[PDB]
Design a binder for this molecule. Sequence first.
Ligand SMILES: Nc1ncnc2c1ncn2[C@H]1C[C@H](O)[C@@H](COP(=O)(O)OP(=O)(O)OP(=O)(O)O)O1
Ligand SMILES: [Mg+2]
Lengths: 211, 315
Amino acid sequence: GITSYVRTVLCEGGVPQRPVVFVTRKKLVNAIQQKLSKLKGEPGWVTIHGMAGCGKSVLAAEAVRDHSLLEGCFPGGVHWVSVGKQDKSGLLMKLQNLCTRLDQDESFSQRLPLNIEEAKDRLRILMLRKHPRSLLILDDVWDSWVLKAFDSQCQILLTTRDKSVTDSVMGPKYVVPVESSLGKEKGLEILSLFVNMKKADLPEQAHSIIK
Amino acid sequence: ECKGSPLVVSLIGALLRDFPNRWEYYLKQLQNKQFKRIRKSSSYDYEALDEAMSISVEMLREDIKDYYTDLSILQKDVKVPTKVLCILWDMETEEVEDILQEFVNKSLLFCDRNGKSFRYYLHDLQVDFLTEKNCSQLQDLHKKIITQFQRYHQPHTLSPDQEDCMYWYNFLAYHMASAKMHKELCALMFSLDWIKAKTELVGPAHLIHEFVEYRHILDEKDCAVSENFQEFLSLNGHLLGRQPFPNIVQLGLCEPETSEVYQQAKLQAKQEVDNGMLYLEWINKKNITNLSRLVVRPHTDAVYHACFSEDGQRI
Ligand SMILES: Nc1ncnc2c1ncn2[C@H]1C[C@H](O)[C@@H](COP(=O)(O)OP(=O)(O)OP(=O)(O)O)O1
Ligand SMILES: [Mg+2]
């Protein structure tokens, strides 16, 4: 049960809304969230990983989707960044864009840094004062210097495919590892939603394809 | 092996986080002495410990840079008297110290302010890096130092007062081995008088230790000569050190067979004899003495007890 307020914080954050055809993974979401709860304060990084298309992002979106962990724990808003895969130049822009996003007031200089580190300063400072209890989520990430760039000393959680990526970084690191499996009961649940029929009404063919 | 470079410990330690089972492997790996095997991504800015040292070496001005390599030859744990560095360099002493002072600042060579004398030396890690990065040269240079010493003091021309000489006893023997020059090695270690002076201030243990190293270096046939000499030493330990270093040349003519040690003695005796010295020949050796393998006098004062190490390595 999403609170109306949760959506309001989430909209500001910019996390994608969950696909209309989804199926909770209560145990997994619960684990990330309880673990996610763990770094109550002081920096910290969380890595989530799986072979391609394991529900890795949706869980990240889903975990924060809940009110309890987020509201009591996280007075700071949540900011989502879609890192992707980047050459050094490309990475630079994302940083400026995060700069513009975070500084809604514009009190900070309209001029944007031409240097990565300066952006790192704007992030750290902004996280430190402007958004004291903020959590940053990342999407993908394929090389370490990238997290080197985002290494603001403020909690950022990166979700990915390589688990090697967060080795440059410093501070407590925890990993929740998503095996690509799912549940036969659940997929039937998912298939039903996809074709809109009582699960039993589903044809004999359906059972086998899920295998 | 770590020698306290916390970078090595974290480097080994993290390395183990992944593979708890391969515990011995890295042990033997560091026993290997190569650091190319150990690598971890880390907060620290380098894949490995070898990685750090390379960064330090580059900065030195080209004129200085060549010199460090010469510095490579020096033992892991020897505080060498400045002079020997002067000799290899062939550069005057007031000057030589200062370049080394610049190194010490580069933190690539630790200082030793013992009295007027200065002994510089390295960390085990620093030494290991050198062989790792300078090994091909080292065999070649090993022959450079010796020739320079030849341009100065001869081993017989060596003296007790000179500061450098003990390094020269203790380790000159060492350099020739790397040199791989066995005939020169014969020119030095064999010399009985060199043994005399060495046993005069060194004692009769270092030579034995050198000999074991010596055996691989030269020839199997000589090895017998070394076997004959070791046999000549067996009689040395018990009374040789005292003081009245009894004219060995006279006490030497006691060995059996002949070998190379006995051959030397008879000729020496013949040389002595015409001049005088009233040496008395001995005619019964083959008929007498069941020789013990070794004798030790640890104390001028009567022994009361002795015990083997449980390992058996020492007593
Ligand atoms: N309830 C659900 N949980 C997880 N995935 C779902 C669900 N319902 C549908 N899906 C499908 C549709 C989406 O395309 C996909 C979710 O994408 P996601 O798990 O974020 O992949 P990903 O982002 O880890 O891939 P990549 O590793 O390429 O980034 O799974
Ligand atoms: Mg993704």
